[PDB]
Amino acid sequence: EDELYRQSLEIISRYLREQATGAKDTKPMGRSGATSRKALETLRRVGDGVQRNHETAFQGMLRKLDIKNEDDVKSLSRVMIHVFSDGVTNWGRIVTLISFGAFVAKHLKTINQESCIEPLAESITDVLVRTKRDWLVKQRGWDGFVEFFH
Template sequence: MHTMKISHQETYHHQTGALDTDTRQLIKCVLGQCTGLLKPRWNESKALSTMSRVVGQLLEKHRYTYNGMINTLYVDDRGDDVKFLSAVAHIIFQDGTVNWGRVASLTSFGAAVCQYLKDKGRDNCVEVAGEEISAYLVTHHKDWLVKHNSWLRSNGFVEFFPVAEPESRSRNIIMTLVGLAGIGAAMTLLVM
């Protein structure tokens, strides 16, 4: 009997390929649910139900802040271009710290943008925003996501956010965004 030995590198590439797919699916589903364009299913994954719960709580608590940021970013003037979400992500992670609270904060801001755009009749932007956020995460933080047990094939995200208040884990990130939203020079980068 011949046994195949799978290298660490092959295992990593398999994990990261699945991670790309899982991330895109998760983020797009959460944004779809937050906008009402996608209804929750009774058999959804723990990661999806956890992310939906956390994002919903953050949206409820920080609606005013997110709306101010949307106005500061001149979202109405951008048409269907949501590339500014990657620029916001760069600001969130600019100090090199990656954690689930920041991932949830980025996703909740993306959900606020999607709700705003849907209300303006631009439903197609939800898919594009989901792609923008997930592409940023898997491009810039893939190793971190794999190392911290990702979401759909493991429980890293779910374990970080047990059924409890996400506020304490996300407050600092949101306060940083609020501070940056008030600084015209920092936001100029996002307007370009």
């Protein structure tokens, strides 16, 4: 159907869920498994890095967005389009968008709003793939991401 979308959702949804709960998903990765695994290993290193290095900036943004429920998560979409989509495009901003997803997902787990983590992952994947389709394709998608951060 749309392999780039499917693979993107798989990687982003797994990272966000693993960050929120601490459990690594052992259910085998779907089509192009070698790439999705390396992509997720890359996020574990670079994404954990951005969250640790920029905790204060991440925390201040979470505080502005005041996420309390499903409604607040739905309104993050408009913000991500304005903040992410309207800026320059590059793997460093893509990793920042996804890392901030993880930081929000951990927040959702603490406040007993885990049911919002899957929707969040879908919203981030939709923002990324809908708005950066041609750039992702030109940069060889998730193979490119993995090669970029080696």
